[PDB]
Structures are given as C-alpha cells and as structure tokens.
Design a protein around this ligand. Structure first.
Ligand code: ZMP
Ligand code: SF4
Ligand code: SF4
Ligand code: FES
Lengths: 208, 118, 112, 93, 684, 83, 47
C-alpha cells in the first residue's frame, strides 16, 4: 500500500535479484536446489551441502558475480528437520553493490567442507559454528572452541541446550581454586508464554 | 539409531532420569483461539522448586525446567527424543469432532432444542 | 553417509587407541606443568575412565567426533591453554556424592 | 502494628514468627517497614457526592493519573469505588 | 451428499448444513468470533463473524449462515476486514479501560481479536456507560461494566447447566445481563461460565488478582475429586497451584469441569501432612524422621502376618500406590486389601471388569435412547455424567427414568419412585417402563454405586442385572448394564483386585491396619483390637490422621504422576505440577522404601517398573485413554442369579440430595475454605 | 497356597480365542467350583495371553496361554488348583 | 526550591536520610508474603 506506515518497496531490485538467481541456478544446476527472493529484496540460493565450495567459488570469482566479501557465516538450528543445522553464508559484491545468501543444511554428524579456501574470513566463523552448534567442518585449518570455556562440554546455541546451562562456577576455599558445580538458580528463569491463540498473519498460513 | 547422547554434553543424570512428554498444547479454556494448538511440543518432567530463604523467590536445580521444543510432526519429536536418549511419552493430538449446528433448531416446533430466551 | 574420518569401526578404534596413547603419555607432564596434586596414576586412571565412559558407542561417525573432541581437549592441555582448575574439573571434588540407593534417595529428597 | 515478638508488621501482613530462623537477619539491622499504610490512608479520604448516575475518575492530573474509568452509582447501600485510585463516590440521597 | 464450497478460492467438501465458519475452520481459517461457541446454540448477536462471500452484496454471518454449494468465502477480503474493524470498534466503544485491573488481561479474546483484526485507535469522543454489578454467588466475581452482551452465559445456563436464572434485562444500550432479582446462580457446573465469558465480566473469585496468564505454567492432569476422570490443566506459578482449568476431552469432560474440581485446589494448601509423625510416650503424634517412622512400621509388619495386617484403600489413592501396598501385604501372606466403597462381591464380583464398569461409556449416552437411573443422584454424584445425559435429552430427546428419591437433575425425568421393589416390577414386566425398555433400540441402565453401599446392594445389583438380561433377551454391540462409581480409586482398586468393602476387615479384626489415604471413617479404633497399630498415609490430615499411630506424609494428585481410572474404565495418568510439601514423597516410593526397610523389598524402583508391575496385574491400567471392550455379561448375570438376596423396603435415597451435599465430599474438599464458603452460601 | 488367578486374554488375538471360549463356557462353572478364589479376568493387547497365579507370601507364576484350546486352558487351571 | 517549592504531600518524608549502608539502620531484604501451605495440627488429646 502507501502512506508512511507502509515500507516502500522497490520492484526493480526484486526483478534484478530474481534474474540473477535464475542465472546462478542455470550456471550451477548440480548444486542449486532452490532460489528465493524475499519481498524486501534479498536473494537467497539454497544449495546442496556438497556444493559449499563450488557455489561459493563461482559466486566469488565469476566476472558477473564478484561476491568477494564473506559478510557473515552463521547457523540456524531447527530441531524439526532431519538436517537440523542450517548453514547460511552471507556474501557481498562490491562491484555490483549487491548481497546474496547461500543456505545449506547439515546433520549433527555429516561434515561440511570448510570454505577457508574460498574466504579466509571463514576460519573464525566456522570455529564459532562448531563451538556453538557442533557442526564439524572438514578440512578446517584449526577447528576448536573459540567462544566457550576451555573445558566446556556441549554446544550452547543448540535449541536443546538449557539457557542457564548445566554447570556454574564459584571459588572454594578448601581446594583454593575456582570449581565447577551443578547449576542451582536462586530464582528460576520465569518462562513466559506469550504466543497469542489468534492467528496474526494470514499470508503465512500453513494449510492443514 | 543415531546416538548423539555422547555428543550432546547433557549430564548422564539428565539423560536417563528425564521423562520427555511429547504432546500438542491444549487450548486455553479462557480463550477461543486455536493458533497455539497447531504444533507438537516437547517438555521435560517437572521437579522440585523450593523457596530461596532470603527473598522467598522460587529456586530450582533442574537445568531443563524451562526447555520447550516445538516440532512440526509427532515423528520429529519422537526422533529427536531418540537421538538424545530421553524416555518420551507421546500424547495423541485430540481434535474436536465436527459438531452440527443449526440456528433454526433454536426455534423448533416439537423439539427440546427450542431456546427459552435469546 | 560420508564418514567423518573413519569408514569402519576398526579404523575408529585405531584413532581411539592413538588418542589414548597421547593422553597416557601426556599425564605425567600435565601433573608437572600445572603442579597438580593428583598422582600420575590418578590422571591416567581418569583418562581411562573418560575413555570407558564412551565405550557403548557403535557408530564410527560418533566415535570419530568423540576422538576429535578428545584431541581438542588434549591440544588445550598440552598447549597450557587450559588452567589448573580446568584440568582439575575432570576430577569432580567439591561436588557432594549423590547416592544411588533408593532408600537413600528417598531420604535425600523428591529426586526421581 | 507490631507483632508479639516485637517485629513491626508490614502492610502486607508479614511478620517473622518466633520459630522463624530468618528473624536473625534483623539482629543488628533494622527491618525496613513503610510507615504509611495505604489502606488506612484512603479510608481517611472522604466520600464524594455527585448527583450524576455515572461519574468518571481519572485519578487527577489527567495524563498523570490512571486510565479513565466510568463508575455507576445505582447501588444505594454501596458507594462506587474507583478501580485504580480507590476513591469512593456516592449519589446524594 | 457433500456440497463443494470454496474458501478463499480453495475448494472444500462440506456436509449440507455446515455453517460458513465451520468450512473456514475446515480449510484452516479461524474466523473471529465472540458469541459463537461450538457447544452452545448459535446466537448471531456479536456480529464479529461477518464475512464476505464472492458475488454477494451483503456480508453474511459465518457463525450462523449455512454454506451453499459454489459459495466462495472471502475470509480476508476488504469487506470482511472492514466489517471486523467496525464491529470491534463498536464493541470497544463503551468497554471500560480495565485491562490493567482485569483478570482476563493477557488472555482476553477481546484484547487479542482487537490486536489482530481491529483498528489501532478510537474515534469515541463521548462518555462510556457504566453498569451496576450483580452478585451471582461466592465463586464468580461479576463486573458487568465489561460485559459485551455476547449471551454466552445465558445460553450456557439455559442448556448445559440447566438452571434458567441468567437473562437479559432491558433493551438497547441499557440492556443489562444477569438475574433481574438478587439471586445466586447455583449449579454444579456454574464455574464454567467464567471460561465461556470472552471478556473479564465474569472472573474466578478465588483466582481474582492472584496472577497473570503469561507467567503461569500449565500442566495437563486428571481430576480425582470424582470418578468422571475430567481432564484438567493445572496452572502453576512459582511452584504453587494457581488455578485449575478444563482440558478438552470430547469423550469425558468436553470443555466443562465441576465447580468442586475448579475450586478445590485451595484445599491442597490447608491441613497438609508434611513430615512423618509418630506418637510419643504421652500418646501424641510428634514429628520424626522418615527412618524412624518406616522402621517402626516395618517392625510392626514383621511382628504380625496374615489377616493381622490389613489395609483400607482410600478414595484419592492411585494405582501405583495400590499395587505397591498390595504386593507389600502379599509379602506377609495378607489379602485383606479392602476398599472404603462396598461393591457386591457375589457372583463374578471383581473378576469381570464389566460387572463394575459403565460399559456404555460417557460417549454412549448420546447414542442411548432410554436411560434408567437406579438409586443415584448424577447431578452431584457425577456432574459431567449428568451433563452428558442432559445434552442427549436436549438433542436426542433421550427418555430418562429414575428409581430413587426425586432429586433435581437439571432435566425432567420419569420418577418411577424410590422403592427398590420397582426393580422387581420392571424385571417381571409388570411395570410399564419395562415395556418402554423393550421398545427401545439402545436402552441404557445405570446403577449408582451409592445404592450398592446399602446392605441389600447385592440384591439391588441382581435386580438391575436381571432387568438388563431381560432387555438383552427381548432385543449389535450396545451395552445396557452400567455402574456409576463415585470414587476415582475404586475402579483401579477393583481392577487390581482389592476387596470392595471393609466388611472383610470387620470379619477378621487386624492388629495392624494400614489406612492408605483412607479418611472415610468406616473403621474406627472401636472397630479394631485395643492394641491396634494404625498407619495413615495421606496428603491431608482429616480423619485417619488423628486416629493413627504412625502418619506417613503422602503426595497429592497434583504432586505426583499417577494413574487414575474413571468410572468408564479409561486409565488416565496425572502429571507432576508441584512437588509434595515438606518431606512428603510419592506414595509408591513410600511403600517401596518401607518394604526395603522391612526386608520384603518390592520388585520395582522406578515409576516405569511400577507401571510394568501394574500391567502384570491388570494390563488395562497401562493403556491410557483406551476404553477396552469386554462384554462378559451373560457369565456375570448367571453368577449373580446364583445368589438370591432380599431387597429391603428402605427407599433408594442417594446420599447427596442438594448442592450442599455436593460441595464437601473428599478430604481436599473438606479442607477447602472455598468449598466451605459455597456450603455456607447455599445453606444460608 | 494359591491366592488368586489372573487370566489375561486379548480381545481379538486368535491365540486368545481358546481362552475366550473357556471364559464363555467353562469359566462360570469354574467360578462356581472355586467361589473364594478370585479368578481375575483382564484383557491384553498385542501380547500372548497369560495365566498369572498368585500363591502365598507373594509368589506368582505366569502360564502362557498362547494358542491354548479351551480344554488346555482348563487343564492348566486344574493343575494350579490340583498342584 | 526556595523560589518554587515542591508540592507538599503528607506521605513525603519529613526528614531525608542519607545512605545508611554500613550503619545499623541498613536495609535487610526479606519476603513480604505469608506461608502458602498451611500444615495440619496434630490433636492435643491422647487417643
Ligand atoms: C586429566 C584427565 C583428562 C582425560 C581426558 C580424556 C578424554 O579426552 S575423554 C574422550 C575420550 N572418548 C573416546 O575415546 C571415544 C571412544 N569411543 C568408543 O566408542 C570406544 O569405546 C570404542 C571405539 C568402542 C573402543 O572401545 P575399547 O577401547 O575397545 O573398549
Ligand atoms: S475484558 Fe479484556 S479488553 Fe476488557 S478490560 Fe479486561 S482485559 Fe481489557
Ligand atoms: S457476562 Fe460475559 S458471558 Fe455473559 S453476556 Fe456478558 S460477556 Fe457474555
Ligand atoms: S460469532 Fe458470528 S455473530 Fe457472533
């Protein structure tokens, strides 16, 4: 619609992104599984996990796709899927002033090829993904805990990991050191059920 | 059968003693909306919640007290419980039966349905 | 499914033994480096205990990842990335022993 | 008011019992107790008499008060009480 | 026969007569509504369900308008959106700004529907209306200023409750809802009007101002106050039961729960047994450690065996505790496991579950055409069962006849009388109602367990069985014989094999008596040897606790995950909402620990193992939400025919005759201040 | 000695058909013969029918009744009653 | 405040107190609620 409340939408960028998505799909039919452009003009390419390195290399070196900047590499944990972890690569093409997202899937066991060869920035991002979610990255130069404690056990950002964790720290005089003890909260984190019983967005309705 | 229990990091006590309940949340009787009652959910058994002496705030040692995981289908929840080695009890979804409704029956000629007041 | 490192359980057991050798040989140095009060036997007993904890695994993929995690802990221990408390965390000391007898648990609390 | 133990009773009706070990926390320190009981204070406030059947109270000060609520005064024995303020209003007989 | 209608262009097949709202529900669209209720008659007054149909000039009321073949329901069209916005604006025009102080806040259909379909501002520059509140009882706090005149309460009271008290007074904007005179709305299902009310006009008086919906944690559970087996949702905040809400179960409680069930949680916080108590030298119960109490009880168990050690099952006990105690008594070669309720043991007795089950089931009531009630008061004995009977009578015109004292049942019935000889007359065919039963295609006979408590209970059972047999001979898989139990534990105990009645314990006075949650008072210290050792294991200290040498604190139904079987034989498991107070533990754990201390350790250490043992005793007690089909009618009938007791002339007067006799029944209810207030209100 | 007998027969399982026939005909006579003995009749599901027999001082022995004819079930019951 | 005095209210303190932390008049936290679950009282008369 119109008026200040509604956000203005640019259709030109939408058309450009759709065309380029088709371009990428045609060039890489072996790996590209699905191409989507969001209504807010964000092209997303879904690729089979085996194509992490080829697709990224194409999107980085190709003359008409000069995405030479790995903006952010992250993971989304959806426990309702067999391949719960979804590895998402956010790219930036300075030459064409555009961005693209490469989304792949992985299990808790299936390794994913490291993209350090494609982007050197991928090192620490993949370390974080392994540390927080537990997605092993094959051929990684140094895959180790980057954010958790040295002796920490478990992957915190997993949806099945408790928010407060399983262990807590304190200083004990008898052992003269900081010791790890089972977590005991003086005030339990009060879970608030806020989801309304009435549907909010008809456009995103999943038919039964 | 995938055995991720060794890789989860969950303490053994909270791998065996836990009793996961797979269920579809019931509709709050106060409201009439059914949007909440559309996705399967997984919750853990409730445990002791004592009182903190200083303030009276409820204290707990259960680390999984607040863990609620939503799942698209019952099979997904069952598989996830199996992966993590948690004893899971599944409650089949209860869908209200279709009910025949007639406004005319409120003004029936020879039936009990006839309403006394509108 | 693509194997993480080992295609078969026998290959995985080879990796497990390699890791066990490294941990077994590192324990004496670790006690010296962090000036731990545990004995070399105690550390090696803990290493064997930790390995035996994950002795029910049958999937080579899971065994591979367990070895990888075991390697990572060894790397931190060797590189002194861990601290003295971190090494001692394996030896749960302050934590009071939780009984297993039902009658004892019955007295202790509402523990299920 | 003060409990038999000697501990001043809060407006929330709370007073550590004699057998309560928690009473030791006030051994050398005072027990913070508010000395303006709200329930007593409103009881002091007089009951306004407004001829209109329905009156509206905002708590005073407009935007500095409470959401405006309309009170009905049909009940003769009872006096219309503000939901938020607690001020009582009556219809003159 | 299904006509093809379209919702938003999506084809959907619906049976003729389907309302537009129902078809939209079929495709997955929940049209906003305030007055329409699935279990209440269509009203069409709120006007919030207005929706546009393609090629139609005027928006239709989806809640009432039946679909026509070819209609394309434009649920999200501009017409529908604007209609919803306008109707919400009208609803909120006079609605008071009470959201911060309204208990319905956070769970108000008005709030959420305004947020999802209504506008975001108001054009009402005038003054709002104010309505004087009306007292309708000590349970439902009424603020009629917030009423939106949805007429849900009136329809519910008129049809489900059956009490024609609520109504609209006046016309226009001054139309007030409520009794014209100052009258208390008395019903066994009155509490549900709180739930049906979309706005916070009707609020739970005990739950008022206590907590908000978002913070409360919900735990689905089963009610134990009655044998209906109503599914409940225990809303607990910070480890404290805050309120009890109905859980949808079409087969048992639909969407309604009894007032006792809804407002008996307060009893769980009063007169509670927390620490083990043993009697001192002076003869006074004193707090002690679990070790000492269990050791004393174990020593007494070692001292005496056989009939010297007996157990009285309570009314709020669970299957797990029952099987644990049964095995413990078996360890001392004792079979005197008696229940507080007396079920005729002649003939088949408890051997055939059909002999003590409502074979027709609660759902079958809707299919029944003639229901005969014998010495029972279902309105108070089993409120939901009576509600189901009333629903069937309202829709299926089910004929109802009661052989008992004439008691209000919220529906009109044929009062055959109260003399038991009417049963003999019906069996012989002399009574015309026997002919009525002969004509009926699905006749149902219900015998109240209260009548079985009479000394001629065996004779009453024989007469009812003979009537059912005559019906069977005169006439699919329809069941006729049905027994309505009033105690939740009774069904499970009889399934396990507990002796139905304390008569056996009276016959052989036990030196050691174990009162497992037994507060009936059937057996006193006088009815026992002078050196009797009584062990009361309950959650509340009501009757057994004062007359007990050792008190073992037990867990309440909201404090344990236990199995309770309803009168229809459907095993159901409760869930843990809060942990037991003080040192109280799960009952089966207590019994198992006592067995270990005595040395006769029971073969289970976890809940799963105990339930496996329960399956070993009776497999039906582990198949939850399963009404197994077992007929075995002829065999039990013959075995009953074998013995011929004499019916007593004493009229079949049900123990409960008024709502005053309904409020306070169990130990929790007796310790419930709210139920006491209800009793006081109805008496005065 | 023997305190109670538990007969667990599945509703539709063909292996339980013999037990069903026993209950339909001979069970009435057996109950008349042994009034005091509680012949508990419960129902199984997706499991072989069994005959649990509780003896004195908490002793139980389950007898598989899978595909046992009515005569065979009666024989097993007699053996329990006749030692 | 001399030129524009603040609005006078009865509930306002008549003597401002400085931070009393570390002094015997310090504030000690405590619960303002009451006992939730009432316990059973054993009978005072020996059976
Ligand atoms: C200071 C002490 C620090 C101790 C640190 C020791 C560790 O790194 S714990 C991680 C060890 N985990 C593993 O080795 C996983 C082995 N997984 C298995 O499945 C093995 O049990 C095998 C493959 C079945 C071999 O079992 P066996 O050795 O034949 O029976
Ligand atoms: S009923 Fe709903 S909209 Fe009305 S005041 Fe209460 S919370 Fe607000
Ligand atoms: S009081 Fe509640 S249920 Fe009754 S008419 Fe008003 S809004 Fe509807
Ligand atoms: S719900 Fe349709 S008019 Fe009320």
């Amino acid at each position: 619609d119109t008026r200040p409340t509604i956000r203005p939408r640019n259709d030109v960028v939408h058309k450009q992104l759709s065309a380029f998505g088709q371009y990428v799909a045609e060039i890489l039919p072996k790996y590209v599984q699905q191409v989507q452009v969001s209504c807010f003009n964000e092209l997303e390419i879904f690729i089979h996990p085996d194509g992490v390195i080829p697709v990224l290399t194409f999107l980085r070196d190709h003359t008409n796709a000069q995405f030479k900047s790995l903006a952010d590499l992250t993971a989304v944990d959806v426990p309702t899927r067999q391949n719960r972890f979804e590895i998402v690569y956010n790219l930036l093409s300075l030459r064409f002033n555009s961005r693209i997202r490469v989304k792949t899937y992985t299990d808790e066991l299936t390794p994913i090829e490291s993209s350090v060869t494609v982007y050197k920035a991928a090192n620490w991002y993949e370390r974080e993904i392994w540390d927080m979610f537990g997605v092993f990255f094959a051929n990684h130069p140094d895959l180790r805990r980057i954010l958790t404690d040295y002796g920490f056990e478990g992957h915190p950002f997993r949806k099945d990991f408790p928010l407060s964790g399983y262990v807590e720290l304190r200083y004990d005089d008898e052992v003269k050191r900081v010791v790890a003890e089972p977590v005991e909260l003086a005030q339990e984190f009060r879970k608030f059920d806020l989801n309304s019983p009435w549907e909010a967005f008809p456009a995103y309705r999943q038919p039964p | 059968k995938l055995d991720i229990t060794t890789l989860t990091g969950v303490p053994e006590e909270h791998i065996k003693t836990r009793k996961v309940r797979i269920f579809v949340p019931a509709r709050n009787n106060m409201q009439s909306g059914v949007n909440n009652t559309k996705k399967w959910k997984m919750e853990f058994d409730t445990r002791e919640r004592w009182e903190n002496p200083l303030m009276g705030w409820s204290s707990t040692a259960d680390p999984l007290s607040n863990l609620v995981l939503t799942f698209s289908t019952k099979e997904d929840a069952v598989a996830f419980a199996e992966k993590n080695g948690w004893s899971f009890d599944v409650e089949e979804r209860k869908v209200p039966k279709p009910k025949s409704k007639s406004y005319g029956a409120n003004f029936s000629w020879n039936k009990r349905t006839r309403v006394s007041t509108k | 499914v693509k194997p993480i490192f080992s295609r078969d359980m026998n290959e995985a057991k080879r990796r497990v033994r390699e890791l066990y050798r490294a941990w077994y040989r590192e324990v004496p140095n670790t006690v010296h480096l962090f000036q731990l009060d545990i004995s070399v036997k105690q550390g090696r007993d803990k290493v064997r205990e930790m390995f035996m904890k994950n002795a029910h695994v049958t999937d080579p993929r899971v065994v591979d990842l367990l070895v990888i995690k075991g390697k990572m802990e060894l790397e931190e221990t060797i590189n002194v990335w861990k601290q003295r408390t971190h090494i001692m965390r394996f030896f749960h000391e302050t934590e009071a022993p939780r009984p297993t007898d039902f009658l004892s648990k019955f007295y202790v609390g509402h523990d299920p | 008011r003060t409990s038999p133990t000697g501990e001043k009773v809060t407006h929330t009706g709370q007073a550590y019992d004699d057998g309560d070990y928690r009473r030791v926390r006030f051994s050398d320190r005072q027990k913070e107790v508010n000395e303006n009981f709200a329930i007593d204070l409103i009881a002091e406030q007089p009951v306004s008499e407004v001829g209109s059947r329905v009156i509206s109270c905002d708590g005073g000060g407009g935007a500095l008060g409470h959401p405006r609520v309309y009170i009905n005064l049909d009940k003769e024995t009872k006096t219309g009480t503000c939901g938020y303020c607690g001020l009582q209003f009556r219809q003159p007989h | 026969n299904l006509i093809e209608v379209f919702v938003d262009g999506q084809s959907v097949m619906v049976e003729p007569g389907t309302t537009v709202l129902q078809a939209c529900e079929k495709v997955g669209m929940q049209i906003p509504r305030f007055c329409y209720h699935e279990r209440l008659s269509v009203a069409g007054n709120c006007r919030m369900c207005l929706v546009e149909i393609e090629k139609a000039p005027k928006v239709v009321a989806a809640c009432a308008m039946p679909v026509m073949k070819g209609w394309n329901i434009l649920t999200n069209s501009e017409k529908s959106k604007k209609a919803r916005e306008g109707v919400m604006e009208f609803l909120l025009a006079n609605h008071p700004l009470d959201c911060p102080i309204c208990d319905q806040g956070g769970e108000c259909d008005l709030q959420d529907q305004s947020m999802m379909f209504g506008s975001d501002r108001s054009r009402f520059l005038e003054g709002k209306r104010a309505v004087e509140d009306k007292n309708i009882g000590p349970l439902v706090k009424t603020i009629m200023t917030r009423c939106i005149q949805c007429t849900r309460c009136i329809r519910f009271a008129s049809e489900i409750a059956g009490v024609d008290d609520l109504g609209t007074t006046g016309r226009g904007n001054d139309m007030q809802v409520g009794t014209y005179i100052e009258k208390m709305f008395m019903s066994e299902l009155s509490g549900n009007i709180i739930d049906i009310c979309p706005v916070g006009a009707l609020t739970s008086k005990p739950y008022a101002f206590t907590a908000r919906p978002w913070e409360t944690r919900k735990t689905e559970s089963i009610d134990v106050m009655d044998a209906v087996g109503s599914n409940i949702v225990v809303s607990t905040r910070t480890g404290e039961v805050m309120r009890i809400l109905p859980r949808m179960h079409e087969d048992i409680n639909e969407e309604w729960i009894s007032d006792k069930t809804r407002f008996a949680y307060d009893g769980l916080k009063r007169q509670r047994l927390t620490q083990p108590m043993i009697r001192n030298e002076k003869g006074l119960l004193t707090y002690t450690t679990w070790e000492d109490a269990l050791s004393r009880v174990a020593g007494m168990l070692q001292s005496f065996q056989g009939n010297d050690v007996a157990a009285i099952a309570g009314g709020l006990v669970d299957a797990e505790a029952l099987v644990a105690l049964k095995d413990l008594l078996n360890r001392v070669d004792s079979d005197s496991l008696c229940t507080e309720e007396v079920f005729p043991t002649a003939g088949a007795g408890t051997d055939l579950r059909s002999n003590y089950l409502l074979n027709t089931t609660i759902a079958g009531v809707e299919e029944a055409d003639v229901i005969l009630l014998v010495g029972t008061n279902p309105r108070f004995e089993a409120p939901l069962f009576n509600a189901r009977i009333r629903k069937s009578w309202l829709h299926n015109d089910l004929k109802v006849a009661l052989i008992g004292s004439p008691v209000d049942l919220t529906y009109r019935y044929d009062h055959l009388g109260d003399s038991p000889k009417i049963l003999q007359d019906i069996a012989s065919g002399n009574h015309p109602f026997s002919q009525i039963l002969k004509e009926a295609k699905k006749p149902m006979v219900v015998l109240g367990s209260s009548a079985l408590q009479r000394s001629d209970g065996t004779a009453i059972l024989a007469a009812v069985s003979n009537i059912a047999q005559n019906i069977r001979l005169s006439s699919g898989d329809w069941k006729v014989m049905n027994i309505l139990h009033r105690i939740a534990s009774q069904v499970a105990a009889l399934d396990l094999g507990y002796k139905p009645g304390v008569e056996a314990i009276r016959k052989n006075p036990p030196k050691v008596l174990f009162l497992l949650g037994a507060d009936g008072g059937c057996i006193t210290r006088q009815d026992l040897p002078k050196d009797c050792f009584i062990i009361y294991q309950g959650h509340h200290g009501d009757v057994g606790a004062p007359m007990a040498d050792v008190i073992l604190p037990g867990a309440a139904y909201t404090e344990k995950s236990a199995t309770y079987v309803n009168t229809e034989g459907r095993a159901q498991q409760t869930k843990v909402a809060v942990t037991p107070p003080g040192l109280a533990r799960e009952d089966w754990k207590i019994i198992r620990a006592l067995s270990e201390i005595a040395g006769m350790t029971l073969p289970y250490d976890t809940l799963d193992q105990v339930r496996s043992r329960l399956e070993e005793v009776s497999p039906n007690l582990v198949r939850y939400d399963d009404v197994e089909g077992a007929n075995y009618f002829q065999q039990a009938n013959e075995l009953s025919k074998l013995v011929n007791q004499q019916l007593l002339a004493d009229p079949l007067v049900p123990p409960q005759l008024t709502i005053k006799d309904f409020y306070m029944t169990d130990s929790i209810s007796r310790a419930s201040q709210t139920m006491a207030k209800c009793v006081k209100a109805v008496t005065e | 000695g023997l305190r109670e007998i538990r007969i667990h027969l599945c509703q539709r399982s063909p292996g339980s058909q013999g037990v069903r026939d026993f209950i339909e005909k001979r069970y009435v006579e057996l109950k008349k013969a042994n009034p005091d003995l509680p012949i508990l009749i419960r129902e199984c599901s997706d499991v072989q029918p069994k005959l649990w027999a509780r003896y004195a001082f908490g002793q139980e022995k389950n007898v598989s009744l899978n595909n046992f004819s009515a005569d065979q079930v009666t024989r097993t019951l007699e053996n329990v009653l006749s030692g | 405040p001399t030129t524009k005095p603040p609005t006078a209210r009865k509930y306002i303190w008549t003597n401002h107190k400085f931070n009393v932390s570390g002094t015997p008049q310090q504030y000690v936290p405590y619960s303002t609620t009451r006992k939730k679950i009432q316990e059973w009282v054993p009978p005072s008369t020996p059976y």
